[PDB]
Design an enzyme around this catalytic site. Structure first.
Site, PDB file in Angstrom:
ATOM      1  N   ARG A 524       0.797  -1.216   0.000  1.00 54.04           N
ATOM      2  CA  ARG A 524       0.000   0.000   0.000  1.00 54.04           C
ATOM      3  C   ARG A 524       0.836   1.276   0.000  1.00 54.04           C
ATOM      4  O   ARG A 524       2.043   1.244   0.232  1.00 54.04           O
ATOM      5  CB  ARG A 524      -1.030  -0.009   1.141  1.00 54.04           C
ATOM      6  CG  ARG A 524      -0.462   0.023   2.548  1.00 54.04           C
ATOM      7  CD  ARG A 524      -1.570  -0.148   3.597  1.00 54.04           C
ATOM      8  NE  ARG A 524      -1.702  -1.533   4.050  1.00 54.04           N
ATOM      9  CZ  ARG A 524      -2.801  -2.054   4.594  1.00 54.04           C
ATOM     10  NH1 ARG A 524      -3.894  -1.319   4.751  1.00 54.04           N
ATOM     11  NH2 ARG A 524      -2.807  -3.323   4.975  1.00 54.04           N
ATOM     12  N   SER A 588      10.348  -4.670   3.039  1.00 53.02           N
ATOM     13  CA  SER A 588      10.590  -5.842   3.887  1.00 53.02           C
ATOM     14  C   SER A 588      11.486  -6.899   3.246  1.00 53.02           C
ATOM     15  O   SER A 588      11.031  -8.000   2.920  1.00 53.02           O
ATOM     16  CB  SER A 588       9.261  -6.484   4.272  1.00 53.02           C
ATOM     17  OG  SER A 588       8.518  -5.636   5.125  1.00 53.02           O
ATOM     18  N   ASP A 642      10.300  -3.542   7.706  1.00 48.84           N
ATOM     19  CA  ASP A 642       9.049  -3.529   8.459  1.00 48.84           C
ATOM     20  C   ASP A 642       9.257  -3.716   9.962  1.00 48.84           C
ATOM     21  O   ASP A 642       8.482  -3.199  10.770  1.00 48.84           O
ATOM     22  CB  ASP A 642       8.054  -4.559   7.912  1.00 48.84           C
ATOM     23  CG  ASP A 642       8.656  -5.950   7.786  1.00 48.84           C
ATOM     24  OD1 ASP A 642       9.893  -6.076   7.901  1.00 48.84           O
ATOM     25  OD2 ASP A 642       7.892  -6.916   7.561  1.00 48.84           O
TER      26      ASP A 642
HETATM   27  O1  LIG Z   1       1.240  -8.973   5.944  1.00 47.05           O
HETATM   28  P1  LIG Z   1       2.178  -9.815   6.937  1.00 47.05           P
HETATM   29  O2  LIG Z   1       3.299 -10.411   6.175  1.00 47.05           O
HETATM   30  O3  LIG Z   1       1.240 -10.937   7.618  1.00 47.05           O
HETATM   31  O4  LIG Z   1       2.609  -8.844   8.134  1.00 47.05           O
HETATM   32  C1  LIG Z   1       3.727  -7.975   7.966  1.00 47.05           C
HETATM   33  C2  LIG Z   1       3.252  -6.601   7.527  1.00 47.05           C
HETATM   34  O5  LIG Z   1       2.346  -6.117   8.522  1.00 47.05           O
HETATM   35  C3  LIG Z   1       1.777  -4.857   8.119  1.00 47.05           C
HETATM   36  O6  LIG Z   1       0.756  -4.500   9.061  1.00 47.05           O
HETATM   37  C4  LIG Z   1       2.880  -3.787   8.114  1.00 47.05           C
HETATM   38  C5  LIG Z   1       3.975  -4.216   7.136  1.00 47.05           C
HETATM   39  O7  LIG Z   1       5.084  -3.325   7.248  1.00 47.05           O
HETATM   40  C6  LIG Z   1       4.441  -5.656   7.391  1.00 47.05           C
HETATM   41  O8  LIG Z   1       5.253  -6.093   6.297  1.00 47.05           O
HETATM   42  O1  LIG Z   2       8.208  -9.381   6.420  1.00 46.26           O
HETATM   43  C1  LIG Z   2       8.876  -9.857   7.593  1.00 46.26           C
HETATM   44  C2  LIG Z   2      10.337 -10.200   7.251  1.00 46.26           C
HETATM   45  O2  LIG Z   2      10.361 -11.143   6.169  1.00 46.26           O
HETATM   46  C3  LIG Z   2      11.700 -11.590   5.972  1.00 46.26           C
HETATM   47  O3  LIG Z   2      11.715 -12.690   5.098  1.00 46.26           O
HETATM   48  C4  LIG Z   2      12.391 -10.417   5.307  1.00 46.26           C
HETATM   49  O4  LIG Z   2      13.659 -10.816   4.775  1.00 46.26           O
HETATM   50  C5  LIG Z   2      12.550  -9.344   6.377  1.00 46.26           C
HETATM   51  O5  LIG Z   2      13.233  -8.210   5.843  1.00 46.26           O
HETATM   52  C6  LIG Z   2      11.162  -8.956   6.893  1.00 46.26           C
HETATM   53  O6  LIG Z   2      11.307  -8.138   8.051  1.00 46.26           O
END
Ligand SMILES: O=P(O)(O)OC[C@H]1O[C@@H](O)C[C@@H](O)[C@@H]1O
Ligand SMILES: OC[C@H]1O[C@@H](O)[C@H](O)[C@@H](O)[C@@H]1O
Ligand SMILES: O=P(O)(O)OC[C@H]1O[C@@H](O)C[C@@H](O)[C@@H]1O
Ligand SMILES: OC[C@H]1O[C@@H](O)[C@H](O)[C@@H](O)[C@@H]1O
Ligand code: NA
Ligand code: NA
Length: 899
Positions: A524, A588, A642
């Site tokens: 997003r 991430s 993240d």
């Molecule tokens: O969508 P997921 O992989 O379950 O959760 C991780 C994500 O959570 C979100 O609320 C914020 C993001 O910055 C994060 O990458």
């Molecule tokens: O999304 C949660 C995590 O996933 C991992 O596989 C990524 O390499 C990280 O950078 C991230 O913080």
């Protein structure tokens, strides 16, 4: 003839009319419904206990087993051996062991040490000790059972009263007894009531047998009831055998109008005063003494023996049920009567022998008539169940009285067929006792026990001990050191990447920032307005943009063109197109950063594999896409993981927060480290937030120690084989795959799904975080679990649903524990970093698995407490996402850019 028509009026109350027997039967019909309903069962006197036996023997039974029999006339030990395969007809050898009244009345220790000693002998007489033969156990007493191999004695009946047994599990008890001896081993695989053993013995020969009847020392019956009527057992599929334990019929006053002054006296002198009242009118442990009591009364009134009376005629139990049977024989009864009545001291007249023989008739006739009343109710239940206008079934039978009384069987069968003539019933009589039906029960039980054992064996590998977890914790800490130190860094698997965020929100942040959230489940774009000062505020908006299959794996240019395109739309959407705005980019993925605004992608993780991205700086790639479109222009101030975004989001209001945790698609963590320790960044003053990238833990093999066959398969089939092994044992993208592989293996083994591997079950990704979370919900009815499975496309039964649920739990639990060991290491390193004895620290957490799972976070917190007892960690759930934190980071970025 008057001497008889007179007794018929004296013992008048002990002659029940068909009109009467009908009312009894009706009332027992009710007692059954109350015993089965979950609401009234705890009040009912007829326990309608579940036996966990699904049907009579079919013939597929095979093997060699030992059967025990206690509670009846004699303590027997058998041996049933049978293979149809090798065409070996049912064979069996038995034996009886003397059990003195002092044992049946001593402590459980005595009684069960005794049974254990007899089993020993019996085995040392065939040298079958070394043979792993499965033991069956016929226990003719009401027992609480949640599984065929568990028997909690509800209450002793008949002749037994041994201390320290009621309420315990006789299975554990016998096992203990044997153990203490160490004389041999024994696998108690099942426990059944003699009624059940009888139904099985007859069923073997008569496939119509649906009932079991015992009329020996005591009385009791079992029958095949619909599982859709057994409220106390999760399931509707098929039928199960219910042990009615009808002896207790009327223990609550139900039969106070049928019981006579005689029944009340025998009771006041019985072992179990007040209980088994219906039985005390029937079984052969009482009949003899009932007669004697009636004869003492009459005698006292001069109706016999000239009114003579001896000490023997007054002695408890001088009159046996044997004598009752001996007196009722056709040719010899009166002769026997004389002999028996003469041994009693009284002066038996040929008239006395005729009166006595009649008391015996009234008394024995009543017992049989009563069992007719109740059995008639069972049949009424069966016919109703089937729906047929005419019941046609077979009833198994056993028990000394029924077996030896020369008028009992005859009389009883007639009364029954009269009370319920709407049915044609066969009365097959056992001849082997219980051994056969019982051993047929053991066969099936053992069978199922073997599967179960193999299952636990496989799942056992997923169990981690306190000490194992502390090792994981220790290894994690070591890998942390390797990552921070400039010498070992290049080869360290836990990269300990610097974020360049040096402090948590200091409250001065202010302004309007754009933001990107890429890498989680939803990508997003956000707008975040932060206002500091006395009255500080945060205002954000965002929109989720989907990323198409082509694009997610595709070309970098493609990917970032899509991203910038989404940024454009969002600008229009927010009505803010054209100003040059500062942008925080939450990405991430593991990035090597030389500054807040430069991040080079080290490697893709999770599901992303765009070409020509690894090795590039993602900020450059973004800037290019912005250039290429040439619509608007941005000022990308920062790239952020993240974890870090999450920590900052949570620090905004919670200043004790210095750790970031993500457990969603992937799993990773971050924490504030002392610069003197970040050897990869020049400087030793203050702090630096370290993006650990702990998912890569285990990539050097330091966990091969605990990874299983199933873990390797998931890794081996992933987009990144050999990488992110720790994360592949924790996050929502992988848990399901682990579970899926376990299930595929179990199905192949024939434990599940009838052994048929569904196409659905071969579809990867089937067990989404959402499904797992639903499947493990508490107090969730199996019917609901089965529903969820059929939804996915998995056609499963109750037993399946149960096994699947167990598998999901084992995997999710292990994940929460492994995650805990990691966090435990982290918080402990901080505690040391500050030189504290006790450290309070709070962690910012986010992730779908973490939010949705009903056990994960809990088990995770628990584990962190146990492994790092010198830390009190608080986990704070992020409800906004990373936007705030990313923005807060972008603010400081600008202050440094415009610096
Ligand atoms: O969508 P997921 O992989 O379950 O959760 C991780 C994500 O959570 C979100 O609320 C914020 C993001 O910055 C994060 O990458
Ligand atoms: O999304 C949660 C995590 O996933 C991992 O596989 C990524 O390499 C990280 O950078 C991230 O913080
Ligand atoms: O020996 P009784 O108590 O008179 O009759 C009941 C007994 O019948 C025996 O053939 C088998 C036992 O399992 C049962 O308990
Ligand atoms: O052994 C005959 C019957 O005696 C009753 O008193 C017991 O409660 C039952 O467990 C048993 O079936
Ligand atoms: Na049920
Ligand atoms: Na440093």
């Amino acid at each position: 003839d008057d001497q008889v028509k007179k007794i018929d009026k004296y013992l008048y109350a002990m002659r029940l009319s068909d009109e009467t027997l009908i009312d009894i039967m009706t009332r027992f019909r009710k007692e059954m419904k109350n015993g089965l309903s979950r609401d009234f069962n705890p009040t009912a006197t007829v326990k309608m206990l579940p036996t966990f036996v699904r049907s009579i023997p079919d013939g597929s039974e095979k093997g060699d087993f030992i059967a025990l029999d206690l509670g009846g006339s004699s303590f027997r030990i058998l041996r049933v051996q049978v293979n149809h395969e090798k065409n070996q007809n049912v064979h069996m050898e038995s034996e009886v062991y003397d059990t003195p009244e002092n044992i049946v009345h001593g402590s459980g220790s005595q009684l069960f040490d005794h049974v254990a000693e007899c089993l020993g002998d019996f085995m040392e007489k065939r040298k079958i000790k070394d043979k792993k033969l499965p033991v069956g156990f016929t226990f003719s007493f009401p027992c609480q059972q949640s599984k065929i191999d568990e028997a909690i004695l509800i209450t002793w009946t008949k002749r037994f009263k041994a201390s320290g047994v009621e309420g315990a599990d006789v299975v554990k008890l016998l096992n203990k007894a044997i153990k203490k001896r160490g004389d041999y081993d024994a696998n108690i695989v099942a426990v059944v009531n003699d009624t059940v053993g009888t139904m099985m013995t007859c069923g073997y020969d008569d496939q119509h047998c649906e009932v079991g009847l015992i009329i020996g020392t005591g009385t009791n019956a079992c029958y095949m009831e619909e599982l859709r009527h057994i409220d106390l057992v999760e399931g509707d599929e098929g039928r199960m055998c219910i042990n009615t334990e009808w002896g207790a019929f009327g223990d609550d006053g139900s039969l106070e109008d049928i019981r006579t002054e005689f029944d009340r006296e025998i009771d006041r002198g019985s072992l179990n005063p007040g209980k088994q009242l219906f039985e005390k009118m029937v079984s052969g442990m009482y009949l003899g003494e009932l007669v004697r009591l009636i004869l003492v009364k009459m005698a006292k009134e001069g109706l016999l023996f000239e009114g003579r009376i001896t000490p023997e005629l007054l002695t408890r139990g001088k009159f046996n049920t044997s004598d009752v049977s001996a007196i009722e024989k056709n040719k010899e009864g009166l002769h026997n009567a004389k002999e028996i009545l003469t041994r009693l001291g009284v002066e038996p007249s040929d008239d006395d022998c005729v009166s006595v023989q009649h008391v015996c008739t009234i008394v024995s006739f009543r017992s049989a008539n009563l069992v007719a009343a109740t059995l008639g109710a069972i049949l009424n239940r069966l016919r109703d169940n089937k729906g047929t206008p005419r019941l046609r079934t077979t009833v198994g039978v056993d028990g000394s009285l029924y077996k030896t009384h020369p008028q009992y069987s005859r009389r009883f069968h007639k009364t029954l067929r009269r009370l319920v003539p709407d049915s044609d019933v066969r009365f097959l009589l056992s001849e082997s006792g219980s051994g056969k039906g019982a051993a047929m029960v053991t066969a099936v039980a053992y069978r199922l026990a073997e599967q179960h054992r193999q299952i636990e064996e496989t799942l056992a590998h997923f169990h981690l001990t306190k000490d194992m977890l502390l090792e994981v914790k220790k290894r994690m800490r070591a890998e942390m050191e390797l990552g921070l130190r400039k010498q070992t860094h290049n080869n360290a698997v836990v990269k300990m990447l610097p974020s360049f965020v040096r402090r948590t929100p200091d409250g001065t942040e202010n302004g309007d920032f754009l933001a990107l959230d890429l890498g989680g489940t939803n990508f997003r774009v956000l707008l975040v307005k932060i206002r500091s000062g006395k009255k500080r505020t945060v205002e954000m908006h965002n929109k989720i943009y989907a990323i198409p299959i082509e694009i997610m794996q595709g070309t970098g240019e493609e990917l970032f063109d899509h991203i910038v395109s989404c940024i454009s739309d969002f600008l229009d959407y927010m009505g803010i197109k054209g100003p040059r705005m500062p942008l925080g980019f939450t990405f991430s993925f593991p990035c090597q950063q030389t500054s807040l605004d430069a991040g080079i992608l080290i490697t893709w993780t999770k599901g992303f594999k765009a070409t020509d991205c690894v090795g590039h700086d993602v900020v450059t790639l973004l800037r290019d896409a912005i250039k290429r479109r040439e619509e608007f222009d941005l000022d990308v101030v920062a790239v952020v993981n993240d974890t870090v975004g999450t920590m900052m989001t949570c620090a905004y209001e919670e200043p004790t927060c210095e750790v970031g945790l993500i457990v969603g698609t992937g799993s990773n963590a971050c924490y504030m480290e002392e610069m003197k320790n970040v050897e990869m960044v020049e400087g030793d003053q203050g702090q630096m937030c370290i993006n650990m990238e702990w998912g890569a833990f285990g990539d050097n093999g330091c966990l091969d120690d605990i990874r299983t066959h199933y873990d390797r398969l998931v890794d081996e089939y992933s987009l990144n084989a050999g990488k992110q092994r720790y994360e592949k044992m924790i996050s929502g993208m992988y848990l399901g795959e682990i579970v899926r592989n376990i299930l595929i293996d179990f199905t192949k083994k024939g434990f599940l799904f009838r052994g048929q591997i569904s196409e659905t079950l071969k579809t990867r990704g089937i067990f989404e975080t959402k499904f797992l979370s639903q499947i493990e919900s508490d107090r969730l009815a199996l019917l609901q679990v089965r529903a969820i499975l059929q939804q996915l496309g998995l056609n499963s039964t109750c037993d399946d649903s149960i096994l699947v649920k167990t598998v999901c739990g084992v995997v999710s639990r292990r994940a929460a524990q492994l995650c805990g060991a990691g966090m435990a290491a982290v918080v402990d390193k901080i505690r040391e970093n500050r030189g504290l004895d006790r450290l309070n620290v709070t962690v910012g957490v986010d992730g779908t698995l973490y939010k949705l799972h009903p056990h994960f976070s809990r088990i995770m917190h628990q584990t962190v407490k146990e492994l790092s007892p010198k830390c009190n960690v608080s986990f704070l759930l992020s409800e906004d996402g990373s936007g705030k934190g990313a923005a807060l980071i972008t603010a400081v970025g600008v202050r440094l850019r415009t610096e």
